[PDB]
């Protein structure tokens with residue numbers, strides 16, 4: 001099972017990660033059943 | 043195949059369904075039937091398994 005959790009946040013900080021807390025809601029659960037060891041950003 | 047053939051020679055379409063169980067999570071499941079919800083009574087509930 002591939003669990004994808006997501007959270008969308010309105011920010012106005014220029015360069016880095018803002019300091020705070022925001023719990024990520026589950027977005028989708030996919031029954032893909034495949035081996036994953038490497039990933040790529042598009 | 044001609045329409046005027048005997049019943050032992052007429053074309054028959056055959057579909058064979060093969061069911062296997064593997065270590066992966068089983069996802070082809072049979073339809074689940076749901077009853078008319080009853081409130082305000084002591085009942086046996088089976089919500090989402």
Ligand SMILES: *[C@@H]1O[C@H](CO)[C@@H](O)[C@H](O)[C@H]1NC(C)=O
Nearest residue numbers: 033034035036037038065066
């Ligand atoms: C997944 O892939 C890695 C590297 O190819 C391998 O070491 C590992 O045994 C694999 N796991 C499964 C369950 O196939």
